[PDB]
Amino acid sequence: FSFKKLLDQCENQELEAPGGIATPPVYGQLLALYLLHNDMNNARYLWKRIPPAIKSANSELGGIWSVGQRIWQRDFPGIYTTINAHQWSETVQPIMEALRDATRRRAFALVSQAYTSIIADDFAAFVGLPVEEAVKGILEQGWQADSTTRMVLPRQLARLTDYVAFLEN
Amino acid sequence: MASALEQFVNSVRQLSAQGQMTQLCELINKSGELLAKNLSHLDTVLGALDVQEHSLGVLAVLFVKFSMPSVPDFETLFSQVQLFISTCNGEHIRYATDTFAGLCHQLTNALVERKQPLRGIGILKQAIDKMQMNTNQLTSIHADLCQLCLLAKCFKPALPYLDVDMMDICKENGAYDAKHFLCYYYYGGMIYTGLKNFERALYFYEQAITTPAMAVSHIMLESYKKYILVSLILLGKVQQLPKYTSQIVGRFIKPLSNAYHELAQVYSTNNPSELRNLVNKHSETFTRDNNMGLVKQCLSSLYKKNIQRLTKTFLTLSLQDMASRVQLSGPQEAEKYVLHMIEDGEIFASINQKDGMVSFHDNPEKYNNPAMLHNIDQEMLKCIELDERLKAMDQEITVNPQF
């Protein structure tokens, strides 16, 4: 993956350059990359490793953890409310932009695999699109949309020869 | 006549050029019975590769004091040991395993009391690659690497060193102990537990229990207490112990772990009302044995087990009837709990909001995809290699005389 190479190259500089206490801007890159891969276990443990003196001095790290708090609870309407509140203009902006696309893609693979008759009033709060825009994009894909009820219905030879001589002799 | 610091720097070159390399580990451990730092300044202008092998002995001596020499400037000692592992590396590290392993142990002890032990992870991750010949070996250095991941909550470097099974430890002059074999399997089981890898956590915790002993210990007590909580999440009963297990676990650890044995009895009945009463009752035992957090996963596992149990019996249960057996207080809480299992992949279901019910279907996978055949061929490549390694060890025993 393209975003998986940025996480491997960031952890190598964390255990080599600093001798004890790292830097705030590096902690914001590891926490933002863990939120994109939908890995709440490594993101929660990384937040506890940061000393309390860094969180109280750097206010940019508090906004990143606020978005990850709703991911552990898995609340779709609670993701877009925390993104447009605290942002950093450095190295987190190009990473936070990809996090909003992963939220809409996560609801697309979850509703179409668990909600065979989702309500149109509740489907708008899962992808971020309004009610007037959620019922339009589903018709161009292939999903039906009922009326007067607001209901949406989504959804070799080289290996074989080696085992012959190995088992015989 | 002459300084004593000059006669102790040229003696490391005679043992490194001869066939006898055992005396080299003893000369660098004492450093001429001196407790100074003048030997590190003489290995630069008279060093073969970079700092030879006498550089690790001087730094390991200063780590025994567990203090700083003068002024808060202890960063000059952590950076000196990093250049020897990366740049200098070392060629005689296979014979001097006593001083090479003890250097990483004394470095981690002096990194926790001062600042945060973060630099020690990147240093120990490079020395473990030199002792492994691309076959995943085990040693005393690998056992100390798992302890660094427990303090510094970061399981990223512990993935390439634990995803592949290890065998045949690196031995040449003595570098392992019985305490390192029990502390490695105990620390490794905690990584697979939080990583939602119960398939590997059950095997790691089973090796620390089957090891025989003579009495009781803190490692063996915490290994059996965690073996019940792990097996209670996957299945509904604790797995039995092998025949070669220790008799202390079934005579001393079993009666002492009465708070964990009664937990598996109520789990078989599948009752959330009776399981909540055992948490507040055994709260004093879970706090004195630092087992907080492990028992919280068993509370949510009972609710997930009742949903999977209804899949075999029922098919399309109503949303209101599902809140009585599982006990979720209202049908609104039932639609939120079943959505968590879809994202994790524990079960596949579909919510029918048009009729107020929920469907429970199986997995429509016949395992006919071409990707499944590649998984069998890749798994068979490790079976033919394990048998070839056992043939070399079997011929070695036949050469030596036996009874």
From Swiss-Prot, chain A:
Pfam families: CSN8_PSD8_EIF3K. PROSITE patterns: PCI. Coiled coil: none annotated. Residues 1-155 form the PCI domain. GO terms for biological process: activation of NF-kappaB-inducing kinase activity; COP9 signalosome assembly; negative regulation of cell population proliferation; protein deneddylation; protein neddylation; protein phosphorylation; regulation of protein neddylation. GO terms for cellular component: COP9 signalosome; cytoplasm; cytosol; extracellular exosome; nucleoplasm; nucleus; perinuclear region of cytoplasm. Component of the COP9 signalosome complex (CSN), a complex involved in various cellular and developmental processes. The CSN complex is an essential regulator of the ubiquitin (Ubl) conjugation pathway by mediating the deneddylation of the cullin subunits of SCF-type E3 ligase complexes, leading to decrease the Ubl ligase activity of SCF-type complexes such as SCF, CSA or DDB2. The complex is also involved in phosphorylation of p53/TP53, c-jun/JUN, IkappaBalpha/NFKBIA, ITPK1 and IRF8/ICSBP, possibly via its association with CK2 and PKD kinases. This is COP9 signalosome complex subunit 8. It comes from Homo sapiens.
Swiss-Prot record, chain B:
The keyword Phosphoprotein applies. GO terms for cellular component: COP9 signalosome; cytoplasm; cytosol; nucleoplasm; nucleus; perinuclear region of cytoplasm. Disulfide bonds: none annotated. The modification N-acetylalanine is found at residue 2. One of its GO terms (biological process) is signal transduction. Belongs to the CSN3 family. Amplified and overexpressed in some osteosarcomas (OS), suggesting that it may participate in TP53 degradation in OS. This is COP9 signalosome complex subunit 3. The gene is COPS3.
